[PDB]
Protein backbone atom coordinates (compact mmCIF):
# COMPACT_ATOMS: atom_id res chain seq x y z
CA UNK A 1 0.00 0.00 0.00
CA UNK A 2 2.78 2.37 -1.01
CA UNK A 3 2.51 6.15 -1.21
CA UNK A 4 4.55 8.60 -3.27
CA UNK A 5 5.92 12.05 -2.49
CA UNK A 6 7.92 14.68 -4.34
CA UNK A 7 11.63 14.36 -3.45
CA UNK A 8 14.55 16.80 -3.61
CA UNK A 9 12.89 19.99 -2.41
CA UNK A 10 16.20 21.82 -1.83
CA UNK A 11 14.46 25.18 -1.32
CA UNK A 12 17.12 27.53 0.05
CA UNK A 13 14.70 30.48 0.07
CA UNK A 14 12.88 31.82 3.13
CA UNK A 15 9.45 32.51 1.64
CA UNK A 16 8.36 29.12 0.33
CA UNK A 17 5.08 27.44 -0.62
CA UNK A 18 6.51 24.19 -2.01
CA UNK A 19 3.78 22.18 -0.23
CA UNK A 20 5.13 18.63 -0.09
CA UNK A 21 2.47 16.17 -1.26
CA UNK A 22 1.83 12.54 -0.33
CA UNK A 23 -0.11 10.59 -2.96
CA UNK A 24 -2.31 7.89 -1.44
CA UNK A 25 -2.61 4.74 -3.54
CA UNK A 26 -5.76 3.33 -1.94
CA UNK A 27 -8.88 5.49 -1.81
CA UNK A 28 -9.48 5.07 1.94
CA UNK A 29 -7.00 7.44 3.56
CA UNK A 30 -8.58 9.51 6.36
CA UNK A 31 -5.59 8.87 8.67
CA UNK A 32 -2.19 10.35 7.79
CA UNK A 33 0.91 11.16 9.84
CA UNK A 34 3.82 13.44 8.96
CA UNK A 35 7.31 12.85 10.34
CA UNK A 36 10.45 14.99 10.18
CA UNK A 37 14.06 13.81 10.29
CA UNK A 38 16.62 15.51 12.50
CA UNK A 39 20.03 15.56 10.75
CA UNK A 40 21.68 13.59 13.58
CA UNK A 41 18.81 12.63 15.89
CA UNK A 42 15.47 10.86 16.30
CA UNK A 43 12.16 11.85 14.69
CA UNK A 44 9.04 13.62 15.93
CA UNK A 45 5.52 13.56 14.51
CA UNK A 46 3.89 16.68 13.09
CA UNK A 47 0.17 16.02 12.51
CA UNK A 48 -1.53 12.90 13.87
CA UNK A 49 -4.76 13.47 11.94
CA UNK A 50 -5.06 15.07 8.50
CA UNK A 51 -4.68 18.69 9.63
CA UNK A 52 -5.04 19.04 13.43
CA UNK A 53 -1.36 19.99 13.95
CA UNK A 54 -0.02 18.09 16.95
CA UNK A 55 1.48 20.39 19.57
CA UNK A 56 5.18 21.11 19.96
CA UNK A 57 5.48 22.81 16.56
CA UNK A 58 5.02 26.47 15.50
CA UNK A 59 1.62 27.26 13.98
CA UNK A 60 3.04 27.27 10.46
CA UNK A 61 2.23 23.87 8.89
CA UNK A 62 -0.94 22.21 7.63
CA UNK A 63 -1.66 18.79 6.16
CA UNK A 64 -4.03 19.53 3.31
CA UNK A 65 -6.92 17.16 2.61
CA UNK A 66 -8.07 16.53 -0.95
CA UNK A 67 -9.47 13.79 -3.15
CA UNK A 68 -7.19 10.73 -3.11
CA UNK A 69 -4.18 12.99 -2.47
CA UNK A 70 -2.77 14.77 0.59
CA UNK A 71 -0.12 17.44 1.00
CA UNK A 72 1.73 19.29 3.76
CA UNK A 73 1.97 23.06 3.32
CA UNK A 74 4.65 25.35 4.75
CA UNK A 75 3.91 29.05 5.22
CA UNK A 76 7.49 30.33 4.89
CA UNK A 77 10.68 28.33 5.44
CA UNK A 78 12.66 29.37 8.51
CA UNK A 79 15.87 28.30 6.65
CA UNK A 80 16.30 25.54 9.27
CA UNK A 81 14.93 22.09 10.12
CA UNK A 82 14.03 21.16 6.55
CA UNK A 83 16.25 18.21 5.57
CA UNK A 84 13.83 15.23 5.35
CA UNK A 85 10.07 14.89 5.85
CA UNK A 86 8.06 11.66 6.01
CA UNK A 87 4.40 10.80 5.39
CA UNK A 88 2.67 7.61 6.50
CA UNK A 89 -0.83 6.22 7.05
CA UNK A 90 -2.26 3.66 9.45
CA UNK A 91 -5.81 2.99 8.20
CA UNK A 92 -4.87 -0.45 6.84
CA UNK A 93 -3.30 -3.21 8.93
CA UNK A 94 -0.05 -3.37 6.87
CA UNK A 95 1.42 0.07 7.50
CA UNK A 96 4.10 1.64 5.33
CA UNK A 97 6.24 4.75 5.08
CA UNK A 98 6.70 7.25 2.27
CA UNK A 99 10.16 7.54 0.75
CA UNK A 100 11.55 10.85 -0.44
CA UNK A 101 12.47 14.31 0.75
Amino acid sequence: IQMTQSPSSLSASLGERVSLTCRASQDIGSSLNWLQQKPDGTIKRLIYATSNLDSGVPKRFSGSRSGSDYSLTISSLETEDFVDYYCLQYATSPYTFGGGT
Binding site: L35, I43, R45, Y48, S93, P94
Partner: protein, 81 residues
Protein backbone atom coordinates in the same frame (compact mmCIF):
# COMPACT_ATOMS: atom_id res chain seq x y z
CA UNK B 1 18.57 -7.88 20.77
CA UNK B 2 17.01 -4.44 21.25
CA UNK B 3 15.05 -3.14 24.23
CA UNK B 4 13.70 0.12 25.61
CA UNK B 5 11.71 1.41 28.57
CA UNK B 6 9.31 4.33 28.97
CA UNK B 7 7.63 6.42 31.65
CA UNK B 8 3.99 6.61 30.56
CA UNK B 9 1.25 4.05 31.25
CA UNK B 10 3.06 1.02 29.84
CA UNK B 11 -0.05 -1.15 29.84
CA UNK B 12 -2.99 -0.26 27.57
CA UNK B 13 -0.85 0.82 24.61
CA UNK B 14 1.15 -0.48 21.67
CA UNK B 15 4.91 -0.68 21.12
CA UNK B 16 5.66 -0.02 17.44
CA UNK B 17 8.92 -1.36 15.97
CA UNK B 18 9.63 -0.18 12.42
CA UNK B 19 12.92 0.48 10.63
CA UNK B 20 7.20 -4.39 11.20
CA UNK B 21 5.35 -5.36 14.36
CA UNK B 22 3.42 -4.11 17.37
CA UNK B 23 2.23 -5.59 20.65
CA UNK B 24 -0.32 -4.87 23.37
CA UNK B 25 1.56 -5.56 26.63
CA UNK B 26 -1.48 -6.91 28.49
CA UNK B 27 -3.03 -9.96 26.82
CA UNK B 28 -0.27 -9.93 24.24
CA UNK B 29 -1.65 -10.17 20.70
CA UNK B 30 1.10 -9.61 18.15
CA UNK B 31 0.72 -8.13 14.67
CA UNK B 32 2.95 -8.95 11.70
CA UNK B 33 2.94 -6.84 8.54
CA UNK B 34 5.17 -6.27 5.54
CA UNK B 35 7.20 -9.46 5.26
CA UNK B 36 6.49 -12.82 6.92
CA UNK B 37 7.45 -13.63 10.52
CA UNK B 38 10.97 -13.12 9.22
CA UNK B 39 13.55 -11.91 11.72
CA UNK B 40 11.47 -9.64 13.97
CA UNK B 41 8.99 -11.76 15.87
CA UNK B 42 8.71 -10.07 19.24
CA UNK B 43 7.58 -10.37 22.85
CA UNK B 44 6.68 -7.98 25.66
CA UNK B 45 6.93 -7.79 29.45
CA UNK B 46 4.35 -5.74 31.32
CA UNK B 47 6.05 -6.04 34.72
CA UNK B 48 9.40 -4.57 33.62
CA UNK B 49 7.81 -1.86 31.42
CA UNK B 50 9.86 -2.89 28.39
CA UNK B 51 9.69 -4.90 25.17
CA UNK B 52 12.28 -7.19 23.60
CA UNK B 53 13.28 -8.57 20.21
CA UNK B 54 15.55 -11.60 20.00
CA UNK B 55 16.40 -10.97 16.32
CA UNK B 56 17.14 -14.43 14.99
CA UNK B 57 18.74 -14.98 11.55
CA UNK B 58 21.58 -12.57 12.23
CA UNK B 59 22.56 -12.12 8.56
CA UNK B 60 23.19 -8.73 7.09
CA UNK B 61 19.78 -7.16 6.30
CA UNK B 62 19.47 -5.87 9.91
CA UNK B 63 22.22 -3.29 9.58
CA UNK B 64 21.59 0.34 10.36
CA UNK B 65 18.84 1.28 12.83
CA UNK B 66 15.60 0.14 14.44
CA UNK B 67 13.39 2.79 16.04
CA UNK B 68 11.38 2.24 19.21
CA UNK B 69 8.01 3.91 18.61
CA UNK B 70 5.05 4.26 20.97
CA UNK B 71 1.41 3.80 19.99
CA UNK B 72 -1.53 4.62 22.22
CA UNK B 73 -4.91 2.88 22.51
CA UNK B 74 -5.42 0.93 19.31
CA UNK B 75 -7.29 3.22 16.96
CA UNK B 76 -6.30 6.91 16.96
CA UNK B 77 -3.87 9.41 18.47
CA UNK B 78 -0.72 7.30 18.33
CA UNK B 79 2.91 7.16 17.12
CA UNK B 80 4.38 9.30 19.91
CA UNK B 81 8.04 8.61 19.19
Amino acid sequence: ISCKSSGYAFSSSWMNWVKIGRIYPENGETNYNGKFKGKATLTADKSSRSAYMQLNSLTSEDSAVYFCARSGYYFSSNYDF
